[model samples]
Target: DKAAVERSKMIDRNLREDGEKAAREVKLLLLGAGESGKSTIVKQMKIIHEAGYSEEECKQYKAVVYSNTIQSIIAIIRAMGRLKIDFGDAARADDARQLFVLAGAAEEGFMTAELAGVIKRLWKDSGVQACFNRSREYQLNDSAAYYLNDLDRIAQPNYIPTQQDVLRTRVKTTGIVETHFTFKDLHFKMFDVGVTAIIFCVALSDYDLNRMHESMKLFDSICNNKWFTDTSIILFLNKKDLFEEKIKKSPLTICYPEYAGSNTYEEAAAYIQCQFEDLNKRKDTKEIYTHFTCATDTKNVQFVYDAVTDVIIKNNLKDCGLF
Candidate 1:
């Protein structure tokens, strides 16, 4: 009888009852609209837990950094053209032509000092500075400011890519990018519709861009699931920094006719957050955990990382009646 008690401590009831498959890795789903910073979150996970990126992967950022830098100025150039803004330094008109060609150099395996010089002067141009002022009016990438201002570091002939630089570079993601890593000693194989928990990232800046409702619509479809009846929905209101900067000019009232709150970022963020929570259907079935996230910072994400991992782990285990 005493030996039976000791043997019972050795056995995992869930693993035994549900078969060996119960000990399998956990999964998290990233469902979001484009430009929602899902990939950025995934990148931070690799940086934080999975021993970081390979040298070749860092090498790929060179082209992306180049494209981000060059394409940004090109965006300014395009905006200038449409806005009918002529070159402020008439003599530098020839220089703009030189800068335009370098976006192609992103494909050419080159980042010469000459290219950097062109960019420096390109930004210095009164015309481009004027164009940069109205950047929000156009579709400039979020990286436009840093990638443009930090040309000095990227300009060095001996430039070696830093992890932060890799983080700053933005490239369009086509297919699903899955990353496997360990969190709190639990194996997490992420990327999916495999569907343990849905971590939906809402691009908070989409408040003015008019994508939040459409984004919430997608969340509605996912939250209303029947097959995965008990899936926990974790809502991530990403790009808080961008959203804060944006709210001073754009009101949340624009999106919601009934919004009567003060137009401060705090008020608007809360209003939008409550709206999503309101979408959670079951009074007791589907639950929503929400957070305001700045996905770019490791310290910021790590705190969220811990809480979310705790949530997913608990939900998954509870589902198996193991808790």
Candidate 2:
């Protein structure tokens, strides 16, 4: 009789495990202000989980990348020219005219060294330096120069964005996007609606930018929401690479005057992280897990994704009384 009872309990346990394996899905909602690495993280997910992009998608990115290269250089040149910034090179004036022609002519060809040389000269002009000083007012991406400088390599006809290239690529997200996929035998549904977990991404390199304060406020608002009281919170302090580079040039005190460290990256980041942690310590809040991220780095992104997935799956199992 006792043996029969044990067998019945084993059968019920096996059934529950099978049902969870078949139907369990984890939901993660990505939230952040513009240019905060949300879309880049999505791109990384595709590269890692979805077998990268299709030929059609890659082709589309190639066109956009080309357009971005031309337009970004044009903006700088026109700004310098209009502002009458002193460019000492006489030949560059003629070269600028030619570049404008190339900008309008075609998108399917590689750029020559002459073209790159001319653009490089214009980029170093004092007028361009003046324009850069007012970049925030103009809302320019810091990476415009980085991409424009690589025009020759990017213009190849058969070029497909490598994982690194895709991470650096920028495409504005206008509306909500929803996707479903499976990883490590777990289903994940990502969207803006009915989300059980939230990943808040912010660019640490934006320490001196206008959006930093606004992002902190946005994070506070979401954490205070009654609807998300039970949700898991993951914070991605993204763009670490840029942060390391920018800190040497731009002090953190520019944004937060009270920052008293040696203006080193570590101290500045810790101060920023503390702000978010303080907010989470308020009433009715879930423990916030934070990671310093660079979405463009494939290895870093892959590691973070795996860790986050494990955290989510473990919590889900615990809630379901199976762990």
Candidate 3:
């Protein structure tokens, strides 16, 4: 019994010591409400920092940007059937207003965290990755070159990074890793705990919670296995500007009050907050960790990072893997 206890602790200490040497880590997890702009959080954190991108390149990326996941989703839905929805006078005219409403709602950053979770899960489920792999050759072709479009593709590594790659991102943002902490510096090593994935987004309300949860669950299922751990989670809350837009009314607001009632700002805030708290509680069962973030606003991201650092310190997480 004593031997086993020591062995277990030894294993945990192995990976933490090598975190820095490793290409990347899921040490920080991002999670939040749908329409919360989770993806935007990741985009900024991944690309907006000192290591993110050059300002010139950032401008070029922004210029070419057109469609996003939300817009793509709307196109899919339109092909399905029109819903009990009317987009707007202008949208109705274009016959793409509802499409734009749904997509634009996405533009401000929403269910992206959940989507990121799905991508994270793909790393675990060989089946999921296999399914994704069917299109990989094409995706790799696009990734190898500079292809930007619905068909261009956004292929990333699976659970592990093989030979390191300098991603020539065609996406609008870049990624930076300026870490001031480590498990050894903090004094702990962790492994078999699970691989973590973070997602960032901006505005959202209760109306989108179901979509958010569904996406989270999809990832949870994909990565849950004895050999493959479930994807850990994190959320990046972005676009605080929405709160200040239009003298208090968010120009990007999606939820309609009165008819939708409590799901508006007041009620939705508390509801989603509790949901995240619940998700955090499940870290053990899911074999992962979770955190909330707001990347667009520096203070918010800093605050979230502080909490993450605290956890690493308290737990004494270390970097003990490979280079």
lDDT by residue for model 1 over 1-323, one digit each (tens)?
44334323434554566544444456678878887878888888998898887777787788678778877878998898888887878866777778767655455435678888877887888888888877757888877877889888877877766777788777667887788887655567678223667788988987766578898898888777785566667889998988898789777876886999999988999999989888878847667889899887777888998888767655564342322
Superposition error at 284 for model 2 (Å): 8.2
What is each predicted model's overall lDDT from 0 to 1?
Answer: 0.77, 0.72, 0.35
Candidate 2 has an lDDT of: 0.72
lDDT of 2 by residue, 193-308 (tens): 24568999988877777678888999998877777777888899998988887787788888888888888888888998998777774544378879999888888999998888
Report the Cα lDDT for residue 296, model 2.
81
Candidate 2 accuracy as TM-score:
0.82
Whole-model lDDT, candidate 1?
0.77
Scored against the true structure, residue 227 in model 3 reaches a CA lDDT of 34
TM-score against native, each model: 0.85, 0.82, 0.40
lDDT of 3 by residue, 249-304 (tens): 32112432333334234444444444444544345565333344334454566566
Best by TM-score: 1
**Candidate order, TM-score descending:** 1, 2, 3
